[PDB]
Amino acid sequence: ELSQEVTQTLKQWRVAAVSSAGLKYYVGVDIGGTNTRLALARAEDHDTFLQVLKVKADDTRKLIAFFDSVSDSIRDLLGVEASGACLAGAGRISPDGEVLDVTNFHGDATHRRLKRSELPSFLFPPTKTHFINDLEGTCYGVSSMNASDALDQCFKPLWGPASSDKVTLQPDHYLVLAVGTGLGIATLLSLRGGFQVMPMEFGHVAISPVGPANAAYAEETRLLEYISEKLYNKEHAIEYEDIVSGRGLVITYKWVLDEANVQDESLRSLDAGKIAKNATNSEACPYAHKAMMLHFKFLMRIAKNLCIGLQVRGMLLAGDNQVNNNLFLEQNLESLRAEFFDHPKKAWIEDIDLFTQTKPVNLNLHGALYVARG
Amino acid sequence: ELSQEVTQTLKQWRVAAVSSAGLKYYVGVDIGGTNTRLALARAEDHDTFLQVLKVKADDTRKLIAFFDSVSDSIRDLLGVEASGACLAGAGRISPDGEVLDVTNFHGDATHRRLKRSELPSFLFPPTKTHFINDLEGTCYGVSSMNASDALDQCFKPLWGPASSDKVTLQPDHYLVLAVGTGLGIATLLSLRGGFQVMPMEFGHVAISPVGPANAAYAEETRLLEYISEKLYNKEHAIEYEDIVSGRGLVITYKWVLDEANVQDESLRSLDAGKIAKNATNSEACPYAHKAMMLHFKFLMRIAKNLCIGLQVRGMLLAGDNQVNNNLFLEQNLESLRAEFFDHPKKAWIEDIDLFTQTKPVNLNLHGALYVARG
Ligand SMILES: OC[C@H]1O[C@@H](O)[C@H](O)[C@@H](O)[C@@H]1O
Ligand SMILES: OC[C@H]1O[C@@H](O)[C@H](O)[C@@H](O)[C@@H]1O
Ligand SMILES: [Ca+2]
Ligand SMILES: [Ca+2]
Ligand SMILES: [Ca+2]
Numbered sequence: 140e141l142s143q144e145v146t147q148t149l150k151q152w153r154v155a156a157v158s159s160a161g162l163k164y165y166v167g168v169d170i171g172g173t174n175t176r177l178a179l180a181r182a183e184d185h186d187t188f189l190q191v192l193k194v195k196a197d198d199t200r201k202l203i204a205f206f207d208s209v210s211d212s213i214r215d216l217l218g219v220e221a222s223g224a225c226l227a228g229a230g231r232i233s234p235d236g237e238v239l240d241v242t243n244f245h246g247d248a249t250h251r252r253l254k255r256s257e258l259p260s261f262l263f264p265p266t267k268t269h270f271i272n273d274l275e276g277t278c279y280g281v282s283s284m285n286a287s288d289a290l291d292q293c294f295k296p297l298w299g300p301a302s303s304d305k306v307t308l309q310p311d312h313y314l315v316l317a318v319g320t321g322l323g324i325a326t327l328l329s330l331r332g333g334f335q336v337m338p339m340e341f342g343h344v345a346i347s348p349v350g351p352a353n354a355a356y357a358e359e360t361r362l363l364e365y366i367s368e369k370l371y372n373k374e375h376a377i378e379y380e381d382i383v384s385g386r387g388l389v390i391t392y393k394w395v396l397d398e399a400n401v402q403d404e405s406l407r408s409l410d411a412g413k414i415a416k417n418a419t420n421s422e423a424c425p426y427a428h429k430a431m432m433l434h435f436k437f438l439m440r441i442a443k444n445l446c447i448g449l450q451v452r453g454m455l456l457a458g459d460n461q462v463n464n465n466l467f468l469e470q471n472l473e474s475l476r477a478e479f480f481d482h483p484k485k486a487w488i489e490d491i492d493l494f495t496q497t498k499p500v501n502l503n504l505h506g507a508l509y510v511a512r513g
Numbered sequence: 514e515l516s517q518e519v520t521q522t523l524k525q526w527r528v529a530a531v532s533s534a535g536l537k538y539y540v541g542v543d544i545g546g547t548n549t550r551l552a553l554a555r556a557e558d559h560d561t562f563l564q565v566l567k568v569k570a571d572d573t574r575k576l577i578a579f580f581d582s583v584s585d586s587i588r589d590l591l592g593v594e595a596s597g598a599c600l601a602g603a604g605r606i607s608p609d610g611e612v613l614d615v616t617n618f619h620g621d622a623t624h625r626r627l628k629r630s631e632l633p634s635f636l637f638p639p640t641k642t643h644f645i646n647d648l649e650g651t652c653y654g655v656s657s658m659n660a661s662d663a664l665d666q667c668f669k670p671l672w673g674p675a676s677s678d679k680v681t682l683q684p685d686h687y688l689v690l691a692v693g694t695g696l697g698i699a700t701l702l703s704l705r706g707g708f709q710v711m712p713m714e715f716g717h718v719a720i721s722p723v724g725p726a727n728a729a730y731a732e733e734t735r736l737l738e739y740i741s742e743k744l745y746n747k748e749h750a751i752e753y754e755d756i757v758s759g760r761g762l763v764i765t766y767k768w769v770l771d772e773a774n775v776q777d778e779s780l781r782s783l784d785a786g787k788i789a790k791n792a793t794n795s796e797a798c799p800y801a802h803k804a805m806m807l808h809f810k811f812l813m814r815i816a817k818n819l820c821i822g823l824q825v826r827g828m829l830l831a832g833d834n835q836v837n838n839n840l841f842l843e844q845n846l847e848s849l850r851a852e853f854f855d856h857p858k859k860a861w862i863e864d865i866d867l868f869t870q871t872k873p874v875n876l877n878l879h880g881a882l883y884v885a886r887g
């Protein structure tokens with residue numbers, strides 16, 4: 140079952156199949172840890188696309204059923220096969236490009252892994268289908284929009300030497316981060332004509348502490364030990380993603396509530412989104428604020444250290460979820476900056492630009508559709 | 514004052530100046546945090562070079578006097594200007610490539626920074642002189658030796674799926690680390706024909722703790738607080754380089770001695786090299802061993818997390834100092850592996866290759882001489 144807008148649109152598209160140019164269109168997929176989205180774009184649609192379906196899926200067998208279903212649906216409306224496909228997924232891709240491993244899907248290896256050869260040929264031509272990482276897809280989307288001087292349509296400066304200027308990327312490196320089901324991290328590279336994308340897995344590196352004289356030192360130690368207990372039985376130091384994610388905000392929230400002996404089962408049951416919204420009212424939901432503060436504090440800490448290690452010129456906070464959290468970010472700007480410049484080498488990152496996405500736009504789908512064209 | 518071997522060699526070289534091909538030679542420089550080395554290679558010397566001078570220097574004004582001096586000395590023996598130069602230095606390089614900032618030199622900005630335009634024209638042709646980072650130079654050296662199938666002449670596998678094979682680099686990413694005056698880190702990249710080098714500053718990122726149930730958790734906290742006290746007055750979390758370096762091994766050693774109330778001023782005064790040598794006798798110098806253990810433990814911890822974040826296929830422990838520490842590494846292999854695979858995502862790094870440099874060879878100079886040729 141497809142929507143009216145999609146149905147009417149595909150009817151307009153298919154008249155071109157009996158034209159000289161034919162109907163050449165491409166498939167793009169954003170496989171997130173919680174939701175998957177699929178979109179189509181014709182050869183001439185250069186900055187736009189048609190989202191045909193989204194689904195809540197946390198294993199690959201359910202994706203296969205979604206792909207089969209939506210493939211048959213588009214086939215009944217277009218007739219003509221897709222000319223190329225790219226799936227940007229929230230995990231790692233095998234050296235041969237054949238297999239995606241979705242890091243935060245649940246179950247055994249079969250339910251976390253997705254092979255190209257399992258995909259329906261209609262939407263996923265066997266020789267013209269590629270896997271990329273989701274943040275790798277974000278970078279191609281960003282690079283594509285930077286090339287057509289359009290990044291200012293969905294990004295805004297939060298600080299840095301370029302913050303009075305319209306958003307545009309210089310030929311240096313830029314770090315891209317996205318907070319969602321997981322912590323996504325990639326880098327736009329300018330080494331040696333264009334931007335090269337490097338996919339990364341830095342959301343899973345062990346966290347760093349604060350200085351022993353920091354006022355948050357005792358309480359951060361308790362939070363890290365609490366999370367390390369619940370996830371790893373204290374055997375490992377937690378990953379940044381164990382805090383900087385949806386479930387991470389939820390578990391930090393439960394820690395804030397345990398230290399305050401707040402037994403209220405209603406405030407106890409909120410999901411990441413309600414905690415995050417509640418946090419924009421500092422005086423009326425102080426516990427949501429405290430958890431969100433620590434959530435974004437650790438996002439600033441991993442971003443700080445990657446800026447130093449990668450020697451980037453700027454960084455971009457991306458994702459549609461980030462749009463809803465920019466208000467919290469501005470309400471707590473000093474607290475975030477205090478964290479970001481808390482480093483012996485703070486002089487090195489004083490001139491780092493920070494951009495944040497301000498309008499909902501699925502940069503992953505744009506990136507996947509850029510790759511799918513070849 | 515140049516040596517006999519260098520003097521005799523340059524006399525042999527200069528006969529070619531009155532030949533059809535002329536005398537085209539290139540300058541390479543390895544500017545370390547403690548020592549600087551300079552070398553020459555002719556156009557046809559593809560895997561060899563002539564080291565003409567090394568000096569102990571910890572500020573750039575002393576380097577300028579060394580460069581001026583050795584430039585005039587080579588000029589009096591060769592007559593003909595150098596055709597190209599590259600300086601691989603232990604720090605950052607400005608966007609315009611004009612200025613090197615040596616991270617661990619002492620003094621004000623003038624004594625830590627070195628401009629191209631301050632270099633003698635004879636050895637450093639104004640339009641044909643380039644700055645690279647020292648580990649960036651290491652990678653070009655490694656890549657150069659991999660291209661001529663020669664890495665097995667100075668690297669040996671310590672573990673991984675390729676450890677029965679002769680050392681050769683696949684077309685994937687490789688992390689390169691070197692422990693010396695500082696912690697040097699760069700990455701050989703295979704994105705998209707060849708290896709691309711990415712320079713990095715990851716030695717300066719904040720450390721990670723162990724899991725709260727680890728037997729070393731209480732004592733690591735004391736060590737981190739001790740170093741954070743002495744370097745930063747507890748205001749910052751220490752950098753990996755604050756432990757994984759010469760001065761880091763020395764300060765860890767002093768901490769081991771303080772916790773044992775060892776007042777002996779003779780054992781108290783050892784420099785990094787004597788501590789490291791003493792450490793290869795576990796039963797006779799147990800304190801040196803304990804400090805060296807923690808030294809290499811934190812090297813394994815930063816390497817573990819960078820392998821995860823960068824998704825490399827292998828890593829190389831490089832530098833001439835590493836040669837003298839491989840014995841310690843093999844005596845304490847289980848302790849190092851216990852640290853390296855201590856991660857929730859340990860399955861991801863199970864198949865990572867580890868190589869370590871086994872013969873002294875200045876890979877920085879090879880790399881700089883590769884760049885100097887254009
Ligand atoms: O989706 C955000 C990120 O989530 C992480 O848990 C995955 O390992 C990454 O591959 C992904 O980019
Ligand atoms: O020499 C090893 C490393 O030392 C560090 O302190 C510097 O910041 C790096 O640029 C250098 O590569
Ligand atoms: Ca077909
Ligand atoms: Ca640049
Ligand atoms: Ca327990």
Ligand SMILES: [Ca+2]
Nearest residue numbers: 594634638639
């Ligand atoms: Ca000249």
Ligand SMILES: [Ca+2]
Nearest residue numbers: 684685686703
């Ligand atoms: Ca490859």
Ligand SMILES: [Ca+2]
Nearest residue numbers: 742743746747
């Ligand atoms: Ca103090």
